[PDB]
């Protein structure tokens, strides 16, 4: 394979992935077209440019020694390859809830700042994508240090995974399970973004003199870039800068071996000692795996950005796009009430797997969406108008019983309609999971599409229950609650 052939293929890939969106009905065909080009390039390349002789666990002692010399906690835990989560930390002593058991000084981190000060610095100061997008900058920082045998961060890089379960690694038929879902468009975008960025930077590295001393000048494969962005998206963190006035992105060694469980965030940055600090989420007996709570992300976010599906995710949600129509004769009034309430005229809201499934902001939007002209005027005019807007997000103070019956009827109908846009039913998804033997990645996709429908179905039932509750208040002429 000549370098001119790869240059021809990456030029074609850049042009294909820089074209505008071909329309939502053409995105699957575009996706498969892009996959075909990427796979042709990948097949003509030698995988990861830099591979290490040892096994992943052969390098954990160097990680501990390296972290210890720079002031990190290295006692009380060990690395174990767990079946469910991959490698993680296991307690070697009893750890009490709220005990500070893990700390990582800033010097160990890989940050956008350390990327600026590295061999990548010259190209960083030149390229507008690197300057605007710290996550991509971290990805190239990781690659350049990976290919630098004397890098300060070699003990960390050598213990990183070599593969991930982000959708970038899925087979075409594994992604195909996501057809008709909300999530597959983000899968499409991630794939197109990653391919465009690889082709763009492949050419930029060839043309810019600032990249002449980078190891990537000698070898930069698609596998390199997919590994690097997947490393960053599944592990990156937001921390304050050294002076505390700005935020930056960072990879945090040792601590980022912790796997996820439900709970609360117990990891914070200590600016005074300039180190990341993690206190125990719960009691961990010796021999138990040490977990942290990553954050309140949905399973669609965990799958796409974190590479895993979390069963019993108590923060799971789906999107629902809503807006006041310009054909509404009350558009002007509704738009004004929403603007005074700090809510856009049209937006992408969330439905949660909870009761209620809607936030204060979505409740406020739905109330205004269904207001009569007389109700709208009471939220626009006179000495009580601002008090009325103040309570719009509060379930305990409806605008009127009729307003509630209308909004919950609408939400019931909209969520029912959304359910009817999926290729499969909830019962069919459960049968697939019960009667087929599937890979992990395939299970992630099917459970994702099942999860979207289960959230919608629960919203339908919740809206139906709320409709009957408020229709009873209406028929019984109950006094309307007054905030006082």
């Amino acid at each position: 394979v000549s370098p001119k052939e790869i240059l021809n293929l990456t030029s074609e890939l850049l042009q294909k992935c820089s074209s505008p969106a071909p329309g939502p009905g053409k995105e699957w065909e575009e996706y498969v077209q892009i996959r075909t080009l990427v796979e042709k390039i990948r097949k003509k390349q030698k995988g990861l440019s830099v591979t290490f002789d040892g096994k992943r666990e052969d390098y954990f002692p160097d990680l501990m020694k390296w972290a210890s010399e720079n002031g990190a906690s290295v006692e009380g835990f060990e690395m174990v390859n767990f079946k469910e989560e991959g490698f993680g930390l296991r307690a070697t002593r009893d750890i009490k809830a709220e005990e500070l058991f893990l700390w990582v000084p800033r010097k160990l981190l890989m940050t956008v700042e350390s990327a600026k000060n590295s061999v990548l610095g010259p190209l960083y100061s030149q390229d507008r994508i690197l300057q605007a997008m710290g996550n991509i900058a971290l990805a190239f920082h990781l690659l350049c240090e990976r290919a630098s045998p004397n890098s300060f961060w070699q003990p960390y890089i050598q213990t990183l995974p070599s593969e991930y379960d982000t959708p970038l690694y899925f087979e075409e038929d594994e992604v195909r399970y996501l057809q008709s879902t909300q999530a597959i468009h983000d899968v499409f975008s991630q794939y197109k973004n990653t391919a465009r960025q690889y082709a763009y930077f492949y050419k930029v590295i060839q043309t810019h003199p600032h990249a002449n001393k980078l190891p990537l000048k000698d070898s930069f494969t698609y596998e390199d870039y997919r590994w690097a962005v997947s490393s960053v998206m599944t592990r990156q963190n937001q921390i304050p800068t050294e002076d505390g006035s700005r935020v930056t992105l960072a990879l945090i060694p040792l601590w980022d071996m912790c796997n996820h469980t439900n709970g609360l965030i117990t990891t914070g940055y200590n600016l005074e000692d300039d180190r990341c600090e993690c206190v125990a989420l719960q009691d961990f007996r010796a021999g138990e795996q040490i977990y942290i709570f990553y954050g309140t992300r949905s399973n669609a976010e965990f799958v796409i950005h974190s590479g895993f599906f979390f069963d019993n995710n108590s923060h799971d949600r789906v999107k629902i796009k809503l807006g006041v129509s310009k054909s509404d004769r009350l558009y002007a009034m509704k738009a004004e009430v929403l603007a005074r309430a700090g809510i856009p005229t049209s937006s992408v809201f969330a439905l949660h797997f909870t009761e209620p499934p809607i936030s204060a902001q979505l409740l406020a939007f739905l109330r205004v969406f269904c207001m009569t002209e007389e109700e709208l005027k009471e939220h626009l005019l006179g000495d009580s108008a601002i008090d009325r807007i103040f309570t719009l997000g509060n379930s305990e103070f409806p605008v009127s019983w009729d307003n509630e019956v209308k909004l919950w009827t609408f939400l019931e109908d909209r969520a029912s309609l959304l359910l009817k846009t999926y290729k499969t039913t909830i019962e069919e998804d459960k049968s697939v999971l019960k009667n087929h033997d599937l890979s992990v990645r395939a299970k992630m996709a099917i459970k994702l599409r099942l999860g979207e429908k289960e959230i919608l179905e629960k919203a339908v039932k919740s809206a139906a229950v709320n409709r009957e509750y408020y229709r009873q208040q209406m028929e019984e002429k109950a006094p309307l609650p007054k905030y006082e």
Binding site: M133, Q236, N237, Q238, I265, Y269, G295, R297
Partner: peptide
């Protein structure tokens, strides 16, 4: 609570043509 809580794997925008 924590002055600088750290979300593991916080979602960022990778769309270079929008940002």
């Amino acid at each position: 609570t924590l002055k600088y809580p750290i979300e593991q794997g916080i979602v960022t925008n990778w769309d270079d043509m929008e940002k």
